[PDB]
Design a protein around this nucleic acid. Structure first.
Lengths: 63, 31, 37, 213, 125, 138, 241, 194, 51, 51, 38, 150, 11, 91
RNA sequence: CGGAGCCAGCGAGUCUAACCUUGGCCGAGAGGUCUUGGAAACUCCGUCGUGCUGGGGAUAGAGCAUUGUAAUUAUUGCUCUUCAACGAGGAAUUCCUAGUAAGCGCAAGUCAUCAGCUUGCGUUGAUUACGUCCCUGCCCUUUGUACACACCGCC
């Protein structure tokens, strides 16, 4: 599978998430344009690139 | 004296703080 | 009985085997004190 | 052409310093054996979370590296490796024991497969650390999983924990010990052989994530 | 009457007093030379003060270091602190100040725990 | 050169080899039986020479310290003990072996009886000790 | 700043001696109701699990309290680090085989340290699963504190609670004197039409004061304002000895 | 078990009248005898005589009991029930030389103590049945096989609906559980040359 | 400067400067047969009789 | 597979002590236990009486 | 003989009944002596 | 003379908290402009990086050699410059706590010979320090002045 | 504590 | 004290804030006769800045920080007699 | 296992003709006798060895002493054999965020508690969160008054 790298730019606070899963608004690197919200598990700062296997599916809440 | 040690005040200063081949008995005569 | 303590038991031929059995059967007169019992 | 001379006398101190030490004074090698130059992280997204840009002499730089959130991602990768390796019930605070077994470990991965041992441990970390993961979503009581991603700090942390606990499980009580079994498990995880416990656990975690994504 | 200078260094409870004076190279810990430091695996932790800057800045001096108290690794951290700050004090007040703050910039660029210690205890959360 | 210039092993086993190939020690005879302590669980592993290594060790040790006695050497050569299920308390070393090795050093001529009791380095032994460390560094 | 702490504690000793001549007391009158006090709870050294869950019960008992870990914290730099944190009270617990025995209260900005033996404890962690504590800032009730030492201990003992609770504020905490044995329970209630019904929850114990020193915890040179006299020939004849 | 007074008594369907309703559940499913018969056929199977198994039995109460291949279960039912509370209380019983250990209680989940790579099936009467021989022969020889054979008397086999995927059985017929596990062990024999 | 000899259950290595035994190798469950060196002189391969 | 027999005891009660093999020390095991619990009982009762 | 001090006051159902009707009479009076915002 | 750092809310003019932490008197403050961390600095030779927002109140001390005056912060919020009493300037990174460099500035200020003196005109450490610092908005130049006329 | 106590004492 | 400031604040108290007698009560000198010599030679700072006039009233909040400067002969000989002369920070 | 090396800090009311010590001698060992005065963990170098293992010492015997008068139910130490049990602990549950968990010894015995222990002292010293109110709960508010600018604007 083609894995892709993508840089976070904003950690969305105040969303109703599962404890231990923080939503984030990541954006790709092959083009610097199209953004996608994902949900990451570990501690995440701003602008540290993370890896994505799925390329198109948007994230949601975790109840 | 333990109380004065716990209050030592580490910046005190005064003028006074600037500074064999023989037997036993004849070392005293030597000195 | 004068055997190197890592020369393992597949070795140790008959003169040393007879010697160590002789030590274990005559243990008094080999300069071993009352440590023995 | 170009020339710069700074010292002029042959500097020899009155105490005789060993020749390997006064050779190491030119460029700091790890354990006076391994250069932190020419070590690059072949993967992206784990640079600035491993840290191989500071040539240290021994993995015992005891500075305060834990009283912030992210400032345990800047002490070097082999110091994090030996500090994660030091812990069990039989040993806590046995860090000179942990340093000497990491010394034997990287020495014998040199004598087997000479790339250079810090290069081997760094791309071992990158191949070990998983990339997708599952969490327990609530659902009122249903045991449904859900697929999330992992930040690079979580990837590096879980990578060093998986390597260390894999060497623990591989020399709990059998023939070898922790040094050579960390060597063999780490070279398997560096090559990518899928025979090590680390890549077994990474493939299992990514497989269950792929399954119930 | 020789130009001497004396510095102190301390981790947890160990204490290291260092006398740097104009000599010919020798570096002593309790009389024994610097090649023989006891725990044998942090010998480079005690070397790297005299390895960041080159031995030619140690050709003219000689260092005698008494060390009491503390455990093994606290003692060797105390010796590296005493060596580093003794070298920068000797270069502060007996050779050029440009060499002094060049040494100080090199030490504080490697790590500033080589010079001063975080000697303030904990946080009550 | 000195004794402080050379490390633990490189002085002690070198001086042990020197006293071995000199052979002027006169081992106690009840060697190969003894345990060097009350808490060991075996005699030493190199019975053809552990007395020479112990003699070299006490030679280095009284070079480094000033004046020692057999009780101080016993307390220093002792250690811990796996005495059983109960928690562990400190033990002592073997006084007969320590007196035998100090008497052997007395009859060689390295040590001598000082005031305030105790045994110290003699002049000939003082010249002798650092020489073999100089040949160690050589 | 050791000369500053020495000068302020010498001024404190003078203020206490002057107040004892011309008899809310002197140590607490600057902060009787303004500052809400903060409380640091620690155990002795390498605590047991039962002692640790008792310290958790005490932290849950009176609020604005943290349960600070105690392993290899040296006592003088512990109390001066607590001073530089700028909190108000320290509470140390000493156990014996899981049964807690000493409760040392130290109002550490140059204030008094009382010490209490702590006889018959009951821990809700090893009896009752009924839920969380109420954790409201409580009311306090005190039974026959009439001696001057009783007023002193009720001052330094109720000046560690949250100041000015409301009417609805549920839980009450009692300190009853039954012959120099301050019995402590704490309850929640409702108002029935017949009356009131209480609900026992949290710890229960009784503590006897045995030292009350004017200095801080670490010094041991502190001038004793009061300590009990176990071996006079009239020990069991009066109260607040 | 039930400590009544006297001492323990097991929980069968047939050992009393109303201890099942006394504890507060149904006498229709008080079924440990199919567990005893099923485990003794799994132990006396020839693939167990060759030693290619390890039998994790469990209950509804979350416990996990591992038996070795080398276990000689007592042949009767009364001696088996006498062994059962020794297991359920002492949590560990020895051999005749008492060095080794053969009937142990272990932590949860079963997926922890299972091997690294393993295929997960159940007993499934409500399933298109694959032939067991070429079913085991289909996959290769690096991932193990586990069957989550229910010892239910009546009900739904939803107990392992969190890891098990391949819902497969042996027929659409009413079989016994001993027959189901013996068919799977004989299919493993024909697959692995026993 | 070194040579390895292969006795029964005990492989020794000698040095050429002094010609005395300097190291042994005796973790061999049977008689040990072949002792050889790698060409970088760093590791000793010993084939024994157990396999 | 080498097969072994599980050691256990019929009508196994955890509250009762196990089947003692040796009759010569069964009674001393029963009594060195009873004695200890009865000693604890009598010391606890006399100190409650004293208080 | 004679003894130094009164022993530990053992907690009996009578003394917890007296403590409970003390505190319930006290909060029926609502005479709890807390601090004040001053 | 109460060794603390007070903070008030400017929406409702109340005292938010008595944010303590030092051991002596503070002398110079600054908030950041990118993360809005506080960077206090006090005469216990210590600067103190505070993060007071968002459930944490994270403290981080940094320990300078001599006494400390005169803090200023770079306008990109990545480092903080501090003067000392031993005639020096230091700069500290704040997402880290390591230094970057120390400008030595005790040889290039000329205090004046007072008319009330016995001593000389240069050796007397009268104002051989910098009572106030500021960064420049590009981020490189630092201007500094003290109780002397330089 | 208060939830279940008050609910059980009123109901 | 509110209304009895009529009787106590006198010369013997308003001169007790002076830097010589505060120096002598801090035991930084033998007597006033050479305490004035020290603080006139300009060895004694209070707070960060050096103070030379020997009529200075050290306040309440500055009595804690009236200490000798770094790089001075008396600080050097004090640390020499105590034998703790940490010569990294100038003395 | 066997040699070898090496670093602490709290603490300071004694029998001084029988207590405690520095040193000499005796015995493998414990201990004795004669005179003087009043630091483990750790590190290094060698030997096994994946085995109820040598881990492990419960129990039994044999022998040498010290003390309890006189062993007479073995006073405790040491030496050699005898090598039972025991293989990291289910259901669940509790605690814990940095010189912390934890490992390690060393002192003292401070009017209440504590000798089975209690408290101090140092030694070595990590992993993981440092965010979120989704779950469990707890608390507060639902007149903004607080005086600018801005925002909200009937629970």
């Amino acid at each position: 599978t083609p894995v892709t790298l993508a840089k976070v730019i904003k950690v969305l606070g105040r969303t109703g998430s599962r404890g231990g899963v923080t939503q984030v608004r990541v954006e790709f690197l092959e083009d610097t344009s199209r953004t996608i919200v994902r949900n990451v598990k570990g501690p995440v700062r701003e602008n540290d690139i993370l890896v994505l296997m799925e390329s198109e599916r948007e994230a949601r809440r975790l109840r | 004296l333990r109380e004065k040690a716990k209050e030592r005040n580490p910046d005190e200063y005064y003028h006074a703080m600037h500074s064999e081949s023989l037997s036993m008995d004849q070392v005293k005569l030597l000195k | 009985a004068d055997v190197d303590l890592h020369k393992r038991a597949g070795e140790l031929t008959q003169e040393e085997l007879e010697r160590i059995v002789q030590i274990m059967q005559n243990p008094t007169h080999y300069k071993i004190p009352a440590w023995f019992l | 052409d170009f020339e710069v001379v700074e010292e002029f006398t042959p500097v020899v101190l009155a105490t005789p310093i060993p020749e390997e030490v006064q050779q190491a004074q030119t460029e700091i090698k790890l354990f006076n054996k391994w250069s932190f130059e020419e070590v690059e992280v072949k993967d992206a997204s784990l640079v600035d979370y491993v840290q191989v840009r500071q040539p240290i002499f021994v993995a015992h730089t005891a500075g305060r590296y834990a009283n912030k959130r992210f400032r345990k991602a800047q002490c070097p990768i082999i110091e994090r490796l030996t500090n994660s390796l030091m812990m069990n019930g039989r040993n806590n605070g046995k860090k000179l024991k942990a340093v000497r077994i990491i010394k034997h470990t990287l020495d014998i991965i040199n004598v087997l497969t000479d790339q250079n041992p810090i290069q081997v441990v760094v791309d071992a970390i990158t191949n070990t650390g998983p990339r997708e993961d599952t969490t327990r979503v609530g659902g009122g009581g249903a045991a449904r999983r859900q697929a999330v991603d992992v930040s690079p700090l979580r990837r590096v942390n879980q990578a060093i924990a998986l390597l260390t606990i894999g060497a623990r499980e591989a020399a709990f009580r059998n023939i070898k010990t922790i040094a050579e079994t960390l060597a063999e498990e780490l070279i398997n995880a560096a090559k990518g052989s899928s025979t090590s416990y680390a890549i077994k656990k990474k493939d299992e975690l990514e497989r269950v994530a792929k399954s119930n994504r | 009457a020789v130009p001497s200078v004396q510095t102190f260094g301390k981790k947890k409870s160990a204490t290291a007093v260092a006398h740097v004076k104009a000599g010919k190279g020798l570096i002593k810990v309790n009389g024994s030379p610097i090649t023989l430091v006891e725990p044998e695996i942090l010998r480079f932790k005690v070397y790297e003060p005299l390895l960041l800057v080159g031995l030619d800045k140690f050709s003219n001096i000689d260092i005698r270091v008494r060390v009491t108290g503390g455990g093994h690794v606290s003692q060797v951290y105390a010796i590296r602190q005493a060596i580093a700050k003794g070298l920068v004090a000797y270069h502060q007040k007996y050779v050029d100040e440009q060499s002094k703050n060049e040494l100080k910039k090199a030490f504080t660029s490697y790590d500033r725990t080589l010079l001063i210690a975080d000697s303030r205890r904990p946080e009550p959360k | 050169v000195s004794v402080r210039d050379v490390a633990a092993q490189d002085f002690i086993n070198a001086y042990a080899s020197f006293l071995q190939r000199q052979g002027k020690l006169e081992v106690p005879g009840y060697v190969d039986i003894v345990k060097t302590s009350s808490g060991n669980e075996m005699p030493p592993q190199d019975a053809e020479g552990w007395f020479y290594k112990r003699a070299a060790s006490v030679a280095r040790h009284i070079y480094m310290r000033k004046q020692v006695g057999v009780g101080k050497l016993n307390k220093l050569y002792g250690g811990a003990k796996s005495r059983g299920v109960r928690p562990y308390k400190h033990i002592d070393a073997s006084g007969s072996i320590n007196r035998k090795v100090l008497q052997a050093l007395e009859k060689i001529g390295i040590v001598e009886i000082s005031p305030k009791g105790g045994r110290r380095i003699s002049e000939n032994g003082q010249r002798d000790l650092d020489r073999i460390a100089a040949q160690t560094l050589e | 700043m050791l000369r500053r702490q020495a000068r302020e504690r010498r001024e404190y000793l003078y203020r206490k001696a002057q107040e004892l001549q011309d008899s809310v007391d002197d140590e607490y009158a600057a902060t009787s109701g303004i500052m809400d006090p903060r409380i640091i709870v620690t155990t002795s050294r390498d605590p047991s699990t039962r002692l640790s869950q008792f310290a958790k019960e005490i932290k849950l008992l009176f609020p604005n309290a943290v349960r600070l870990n105690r392993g290899n914290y040296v006592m003088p730099n512990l109390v001066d680090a607590c001073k530089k944190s700028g909190t108000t009270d320290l509470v140390v617990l000493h156990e014996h085989r899981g049964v807690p025995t000493s409760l040392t209260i130290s109002h550490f900005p140059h204030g008094p340290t009382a010490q209490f033996s702590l006889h018959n404890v009951v821990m809700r962690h090893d009896i009752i699963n009924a839920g969380n504590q109420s954790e409201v800032n409580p009311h306090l009730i005190f039974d026959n504190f009439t001696t001057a030492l009783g007023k002193r201990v009720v001052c330094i003992l109720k000046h560690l609670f949250n100041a000015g609770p409301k009417k609805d504020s549920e839980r009450v905490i009692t300190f009853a004197n039954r012959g120099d044995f301050i019995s402590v329970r704490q309850h929640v209630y409702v108002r029935t039409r017949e009356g009131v019904e209480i609900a026992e929850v949290g710890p229960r114990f009784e503590m006897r004061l045995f030292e009350l020193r004017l200095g801080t915890l670490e010094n041991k040179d502190a001038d004793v304002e009061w300590q009990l006299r176990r071996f006079i020939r009239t020990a069991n004849k009066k109260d607040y000895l | 078990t039930h400590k009544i007074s006297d001492k323990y008594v097991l929980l069968n369907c047939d050992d009393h009248q109303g201890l099942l309703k006394k504890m507060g559940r149904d006498i229709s499913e008080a079924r440990p005898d199919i567990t005893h018969q099923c485990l003794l056929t799994l132990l006396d199977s020839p693939i167990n005589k060759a030693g290619k198994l390890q039998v994790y039995i469990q209950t509804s109460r979350g416990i996990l009991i591992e038996v070795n291949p080398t276990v000689r279960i007592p042949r009767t039912f009364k001696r088996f029930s006498g062994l059962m509370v020794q297991l359920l209380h002492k949590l560990s019983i020895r051999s005749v030389n008492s060095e080794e250990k053969l009937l142990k209680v272990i932590k949860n989940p079963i997926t922890d103590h299972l091997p690294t790579k393993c295929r997960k099936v159940t007993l499934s009467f409500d399933a298109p049945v694959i032939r067991v021989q070429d079913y085991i022969e289909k996959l290769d020889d690096d991932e193990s096989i586990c069957v989550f054979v229910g010892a239910m008397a009546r009900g739904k086999d939803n107990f392992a609906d969190e890891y098990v995927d391949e819902k497969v059985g042996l027929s659409n017929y009413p079989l016994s559980a001993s027959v189901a596990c013996s068919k799977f062990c004989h299919g493993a024999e024909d697959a692995w040359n026993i | 400067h070194d040579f390895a000899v292969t006795s029964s259950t005990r492989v020794q290595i000698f040095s050429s400067r002094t010609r005395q035994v300097i190291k042994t190798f005796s973790r061999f469950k049977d008689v040990v047969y072949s002792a050889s060196f790698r060409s970088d002189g760093k590791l000793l391969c010993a084939g024994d009789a157990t396999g | 597979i080498p097969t072994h027999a599980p050691k256990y005891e019929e009508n196994f009660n955890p509250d009762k002590k196990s089947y003692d093999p040796d009759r010569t020390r069964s009674e001393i095991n029963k009594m060195k236990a009873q004695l200890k619990k009865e000693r604890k009982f009598t010391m606890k009762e006399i100190r409650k009486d004293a208080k | 003989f004679d003894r130094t001090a009164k022993p530990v006051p053992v907690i009996t159902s009578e003394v917890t009944e007296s403590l409970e009707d003390m505190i319930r009479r006290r909060i029926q009076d609502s005479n709890f002596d807390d601090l004040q915002r001053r | 003379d109460n060794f603390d750092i007070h903070v008030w809310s400017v929406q409702t003019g109340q005292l938010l908290d008595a944010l303590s932490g030092h051991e002596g008197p503070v002398s110079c403050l600054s908030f950041s402009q990118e993360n809005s961390v506080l960077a206090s600095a006090s005469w216990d030779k210590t600067i103190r990086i505070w993060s007071i927002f968002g459930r944490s109140q994270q403290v981080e001390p940094i320990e300078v050699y001599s006494d400390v005056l005169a803090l200023s912060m770079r306008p990109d919020g990545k480092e903080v410059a501090v003067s000392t009493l031993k005639g020096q300037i230091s700069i500290f990174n704040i997402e880290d706590a390591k230094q970057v460099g120390n400008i030595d500035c005790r040889k290039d200020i000329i205090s004046g010979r007072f008319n009330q003196d016995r001593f000389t005109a240069k050796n007397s450490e009268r104002s051989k320090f910098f009572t106030t610092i500021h960064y420049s908005f590009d981020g490189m130049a630092i201007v500094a002045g003290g109780n002397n006329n330089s | 504590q208060l939830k279940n106590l008050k609910a059980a004492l009123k109901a | 004290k509110i209304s009895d400031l009529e009787n106590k604040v006198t010369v013997s108290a308003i001169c007790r804030r002076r830097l010589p007698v505060i120096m002598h009560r801090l035991k930084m000198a033998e007597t006033i006769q050479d305490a004035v010599k020290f603080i006139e030679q300009g060895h004694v700072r209070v707070g960060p800045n050096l103070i030379n006039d020997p009529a200075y009233l050290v306040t309440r909040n500055m009595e804690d920080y009236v200490t000798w400067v770094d790089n001075s002969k008396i600080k050097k000989t004090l640390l020499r007699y105590r034998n703790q002369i940490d010569d990294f920070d100038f003395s």
